[PDB]
Enzyme design. Structure first.
Site, PDB file in Angstrom:
ATOM      1  N   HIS A 133     -25.881 -13.459  -0.476  1.00 30.10           N
ATOM      2  CA  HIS A 133     -25.392 -14.605  -0.365  1.00 30.10           C
ATOM      3  C   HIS A 133     -25.792 -15.218  -1.725  1.00 30.10           C
ATOM      4  CE1 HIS A 133     -26.474 -18.978   0.063  1.00 30.10           C
ATOM      5  NE2 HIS A 133     -27.637 -18.447  -0.312  1.00 30.10           N
TER       6      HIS A 133
HETATM    7 ZN   LIG Z   1     -27.769 -20.589  -0.076  1.00 30.20          ZN
END
Ligand SMILES: [Zn+2]
Ligand SMILES: [K+]
Ligand SMILES: [K+]
Ligand SMILES: [K+]
Ligand SMILES: [K+]
Ligand SMILES: [Mg+2]
Ligand SMILES: [Mg+2]
Ligand SMILES: [Zn+2]
Ligand SMILES: [Zn+2]
Ligand SMILES: [Zn+2]
EC number: 3.5.1.98
Lengths: 594, 594
Positions: A133
């Site tokens: 991410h």
């Molecule tokens: Zn984040």
């Protein structure tokens, strides 16, 4: 009443094969389970479910080639042409994690399509890619895809990114595009926080046609919470969104700003995510698409995701933990407002700037003091008291050195109340007021035929300059005067100079009292080795006015003489202290002379 | 997912008996019909209806006696005791319209109870009293009743009143009560508009314990619309509501602020009512109760009521007509913000005040001009030019009257940029800047060894003073000087003084050019009977800089010489005109001297 959409395809057994998929496969599992436990969805999808189950999809090569190519079509540049090798390696690379990339990308497009076509009111895609991410990402691909496929319904897309990380990719993908508004709230800290780029600073508002269609809200520190985010939404995000008038809203919905997330270190409760979602649902005829993003705490993700889902379904959000915005947050929003007032009608007042280096530009500090010096010369022949160092900073009455009584006033700059049209920071000079209570004491001192010295403290280490200036005036002018009775009146940070003077020079002889109007300045006392004599004298020859909200009340245990005789004041500001305690203080000092 | 509540009991046949019920009985009929046509409710109530039908009720005597009495219970005062005769005559009077009073009051309590008990998510009472629109009213009785019956769930009630009339009764009923927040948007116009009382002014914020729990938004004129109300909701209503954190929201829901209503003369579209409703539904765990009130256009009521109902059901609201707030509206909201910043954390900046009559208080107008006069004396020996009338307003260089070239600058006060903490209107004197481009011309003129005269125009008829001061300086100083070549540079409203001078005196001989930096001032020209000679001269001896957004562009048909030679400027402000056109203008005037 249309249902909401939900896309979910965990593939837990397939995910058990992967080893060495940094994305935690049980992230989507926990989200779905929480929604199911609440009774909004079933393992066996039913027409009774308030969430309509949308089947997951794989993004095709032709599909993705259209996105990268059709936007180039909408002058010509070879370096702007779609590259088949790159577009393919992103969808079909060697590792079997490629399947998740295709599934996540396609499912986002499919889920958002269900919203645009009006099949559902809104939707929540719970299908995650394999990679870490924080070349278009899913949100960007989806946004561009909708603009291309449904041009008669979708002409403006709003992207709200409330993951704690700035979306560099998303911003850069639409930085020149005026039809896609990117709004991001993120932990920035002067670009120290990941991704560690200055690309997410408040000043970057886009370029070319897309100028004014990128809004960054960079938090300057950790610990932001419910009140801070609802404050930002009410003052910045929603006003801008209403003005942009999007046809579609896509949320880059991360949860690493949630309480419990050790990476983000923010304090957003689930209610904050529920309120933010509910606010956005007023836009774009309700066409809202939630894309699941970051988050490092499965429990925080679970509870926060449930809150978002609940808002989509129209379930009322819970009570916020607090509506209080901290000083750092409001300062950030003020900064954002000043920048953004250049491009958005709703961001006011407009901030105009000027360069003090220019010959025709002067700081008000010097303007005000010059005015005082002029006014005092005309009225009392008060003149400049020179300060040799390697103008009008210090003023003194004529023949101050021949008076029995001598008043020395040490003060920060006066209060100036800025008023006018609230459209800009330009002032109405008729309604804007100089409020100068120190002049009451100056006037009074002259009427008593006292000697007078007036020291103006400078503004932005800084206390060093204050202490040194007080010593300079003492050694060079006050010490060598004739006055048998010397008085000191301090305001704000002037206290540091006066207590340091009492600790550095033999003032016990001639100084009869040392008044200090602290205001918002924290209480401070003497710093000396003298355990008995000096602190006793200071206590018996001082008036230290303190507000009920002074910082000394947070650990108010020690009652020391070296803090001086503490006096209660109803007023929090130094300016109000001086004006209101004027009568009582003047009469008190007269009685000391007997 | 809980249903919404709907109370409706038209009694059309009974209403056909009444004659000589000012309330139009078909008001409720049109509302219900619109909701039914949309398919949200049926004549025969079904479990499939998204609106749950709540049966109407008659308010009992004992019930209403409890309300008036129990609040007195919660020191003792005989004049505060419940009166049985009065309470009874309001519920049971001679006329048969009394039945409608009982039915409307009871149905409001019953409908709101369904919300508080959680039987429904929210509700809409469509049952009206007999009397005229605009002793507790229905909203007040309901609010007090809920606080009394359900003290464990309801401790704070929010009342939002968006009928265009101020609710004097509702405000007065809770004016001393801190647990009931009353918020009202209404057409006020200095208390000229009905009810014609000053009771709804912005300054009335409550009293006693209830101080700070009454918020009035009094519009100063007619024609307010979507953007104005959404602006007020985003900047005032919702921030305050979130801070108050109500357990129940009651809406005094009138529609006489709707487009088409001949009484209110406002322009709210149905979407505005949908958006306002949807915003409020974020509060009080969704516990919202809508009470139908005023409105004079059945079609406006019908469409607007449908919009409100749609929001209750969770149906997305439509697009606003506009998000643009007019100057009158923002000025109203600014005024409200200043007042309300005293009592509400979310209303910032805090506004501090001072009295210019006080000796220690001065208007910045005089501070700035005194500073200029001082700075100019030190640098060029520029001195005060006295103006006999029945200081430092006009400045002149020494021996200005012995120079061949003479510059006369006529200007409004300089630009001052107010900066600092945005918590108050107190300025940071280091970051606040005096921006004085006129000084560029002053400096330049002195370098050329020209004579100089500097006239500072006053601020708030006003043009009369400007024209007279220009004539005075001309007749007394400029006319009697030696200069063969006279120049004029005007800023803003100074144009009125210069064109009037050119029309009132024989300036054609010695005046070589008249520059005017209009800025935001509308273009004006000569006013003379001279059809040929004078307008030709002015056109050939002037530079009139105009912005692209000057008011003369709204009817830009006439190209007259008496308007002067119009010149294009990129800048809208006089200050920016002077600074940026400085080089071009100075060189132009030098070349005129050959
Ligand atoms: Zn984040
Ligand atoms: K973000
Ligand atoms: K953009
Ligand atoms: K009202
Ligand atoms: K109240
Ligand atoms: Mg300068
Ligand atoms: Mg005064
Ligand atoms: Zn995967
Ligand atoms: Zn009736
Ligand atoms: Zn009304």
């Amino acid at each position: 009443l249309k249902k909401s959409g939900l896309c979910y395809d965990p593939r837990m057994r397939f995910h058990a094969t992967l080893s060495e998929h940094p994305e935690d496969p049980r992230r989507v599992l926990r989200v779905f389970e929480a929604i199911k436990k609440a009774g909004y969805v079933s393992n066996v999808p039913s027409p009774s479910d308030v969430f309509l189950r949308i089947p997951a999809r794989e993004a095709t090569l032709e599909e993705l080639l259209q996105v990268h190519s059709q936007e180039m079509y909408d002058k010509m540049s070879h370096e702007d042409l779609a590259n088949l090798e790159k577009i393919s390696d992103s969808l079909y690379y060697n590792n079997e994690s490629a399947f998740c990339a295709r599934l996540a990308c396609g499912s986002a497009i499919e889920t958002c399509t269900a919203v645009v076509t009006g099949q559902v009111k809104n939707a929540f895609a719970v299908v995650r890619p394999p990679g870490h991410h924080a070349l278009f990402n899913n949100v960007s691909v989806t946004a561009r895809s909708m603009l291309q496929r449904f041009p008669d319904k979708i002409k403006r897309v709003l992207i709200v990114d409330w993951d704690i990380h700035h979306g560099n990719g998303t911003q850069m993908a639409f930085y020149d595009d005026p039809n896609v508004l990117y709004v991001s709230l993120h932990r920035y800290e002067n670009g120290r926080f990941y991704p560690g780029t200055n690309y997410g600073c408040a000043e970057n508002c886009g370029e070319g046609p897309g100028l004014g269609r990128t809004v960054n809200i960079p938090w300057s520190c950790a610990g932001m919470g419910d009140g801070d985010y609802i404050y930002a939404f009410q003052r910045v995000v929603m006003p801008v969104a209403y003005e942009f008038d999007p046809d579609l809203v896509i949320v880059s919905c991360g949860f690493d700003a949630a309480a419990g997330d050790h990476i983000g270190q923010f304090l957003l409760t689930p209610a904050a995510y529920a309120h933010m979602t509910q606010m956005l649902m007023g836009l774009a005829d309700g066409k809202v698409f939630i894309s699941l993003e970051g988050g490092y705490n499965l429990d925080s993700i679970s509870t926060s995701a449930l809150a978002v889902a609940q808002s989509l379904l129209g379930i009322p959000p819970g009570r916020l933990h607090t509506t209080y915005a901290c000083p750092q947050a409001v300062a950030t929003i003020n900064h954002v407002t000043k920048i953004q007032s250049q491009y958005w009608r709703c961001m006011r007042p407009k901030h105009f700037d000027a360069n003090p280096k220019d010959a025709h530009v002067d700081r008000l500090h010097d303007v005000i003091r010059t005015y005082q010096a002029k006014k005092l010369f005309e009225d009392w022949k008060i003149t400049n008291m020179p300060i040799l160092r390697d103008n009008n900073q210090v003023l003194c009455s004529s023949n101050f050195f021949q008076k029995d009584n001598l008043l020395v006033i040490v003060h920060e700059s006066p209060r100036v109340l800025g008023n006018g049209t609230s459209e800009t920071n330009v002032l109405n000079l008729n309604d804007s007021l100089l409020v100068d209570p120190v002049s009451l004491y100056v006037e009074w001192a002259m009427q008593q035929d006292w000697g007078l010295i007036d020291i103006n403290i400078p503004e932005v280490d800084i206390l060093s300059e204050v202490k040194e200036l007080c010593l300079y005036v003492w050694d060079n002018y006050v010490e060598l005067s004739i006055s048998k009775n010397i008085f000191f009146i301090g305001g704000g940070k002037a206290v540091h100079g006066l207590v340091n003077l009492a600790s550095s020079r033999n003032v016990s002889d001639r100084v009869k009292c040392m008044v200090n109007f602290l205001g918002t300045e924290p209480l401070v006392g003497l710093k000396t080795a003298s355990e008995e004599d000096l602190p006793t004298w200071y206590y018996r020859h001082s008036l230290v006015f303190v507000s009920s909200s002074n910082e000394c009340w947070k650990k108010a245990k020690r009652a020391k003489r070296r803090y001086g005789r503490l006096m209660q004041s109803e007023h929090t500001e130094t300016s109000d202290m001086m004006e209101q305690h004027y009568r009582a203080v003047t009469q008190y000092l007269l009685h000391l002379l007997q």
